[PDB]
Design a protein around this ligand. Structure first.
Ligand SMILES: O=C1NCCc2[nH]c(-c3ccnc(-c4cnc5ccccc5c4)c3)cc21
Length: 273
């Protein structure tokens, strides 16, 4: 577990920000003797920070989860902090990468992306962790290369559980799939964009987007759905997604912000009716 000596003994730090999570900022850094580029998450010590560390550490090593390399407990600006060192996710965000394709983005590619995410959620749900904030910011690629791996990160709202909490992940899966398939969020399946999408795909989304949490597919049901289970047999049909992502790039931040809002809403103890 946690190293009590200075992070800076092992890592050269940078001021380049790679991301922003509820509990802290993500900075680029380099391992001093290896030279490997890594990412540094600075958590000011708190029981929430300690939970994040605990949950991410448990999840680390699971399929399609951003790995922790080390964790430091340091003093920084007179305050006790935790520094999570993680693999550098040099490919950036999932949907930025889709956008940066021109090339065909096909239904089978979305099915394989969705399977990867499901495989992460499967791992987490079987270890009774619910993530509770699966969203575009948290879905990242290991490189900019063709063979990059999609991983999930940020365990700052994770909870060691509750079917309810698990169903918030299942819901994220349906939102992300929806955007994967057309380029815009569900917040029906309109033409032209949905015109050519599988009935399987649209059926899966309806089962994940149930207004009633208990009516939503569980991860096991999701992974056994033929659209996921038989993802490689899914139609190679060209989607509108990249094109739409490009066209509406100006409204992307808003999409991100209302998903964040939606997910926070699902996390409140008592909500309106
Ligand atoms: O916990 C988090 N909260 C939300 C945003 C975030 N990004 C990361 C993260 C982790 C590792 N690497 C990156 C990263 C992302 N994007 C990049 C683009 C280009 C070069 C390097 C990059 C590294 C981000 C962690 C978290």
């Amino acid at each position: 577990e946690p190293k009590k000596y200075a992070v800076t003994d092992d890592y050269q730090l940078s001021k380049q920000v790679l991301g922003l999570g509820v509990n802290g900022k993500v900075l680029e850094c380099f391992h001093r003797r290896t030279g490997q580029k890594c990412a540094l998450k600075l958590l000011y010590d708190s029981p929430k920070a300690r939970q994040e560390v605990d949950h991410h550490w448990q999840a680390s090593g699971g399929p399609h989860i951003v790995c922790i390399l080390d964790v430091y407990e340091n003093m920084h600006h007179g305050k006790r902090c935790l520094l999570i060192i993680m693999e550098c996710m040099e490919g950036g965000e999932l949907f930025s990468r889709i956008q940066e394709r021109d090339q065909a983005f096909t239904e089978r590619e979305a099915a394989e992306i969705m399977r990867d995410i499901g495989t992460a959620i499967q791992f987490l749900h079987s270890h009774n962790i619910a993530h509770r904030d699966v969203k575009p910011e948290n879905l990242l690629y290991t490189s900019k290369e063709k063979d990059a791996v999609l991983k999930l990160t940020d365990f700052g709202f994770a909870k060691e559980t509750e079917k309810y909490d698990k169903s918030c992940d299942m819901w994220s899966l349906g939102v992300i799939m929806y955007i994967l398939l057309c380029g815009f969020p569900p917040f029906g399946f309109p033409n032209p964009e949905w015109s050519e999408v599988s009935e399987d795909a649209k059926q899966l989304i309806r089962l994940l987007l149930k207004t009633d949490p208990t009516e939503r597919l569980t991860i096991t049901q999701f992974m056994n759905h033929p659209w996921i289970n038989q993802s490689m047999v899914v139609p190679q049909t060209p989607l509108h997604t990249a094109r739409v992502l490009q066209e509406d790039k100006d409204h992307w931040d808003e999409v991100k912000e209302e998903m964040t809002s939606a997910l926070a809403t699902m996390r409140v103890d008592y909500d309106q009716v």
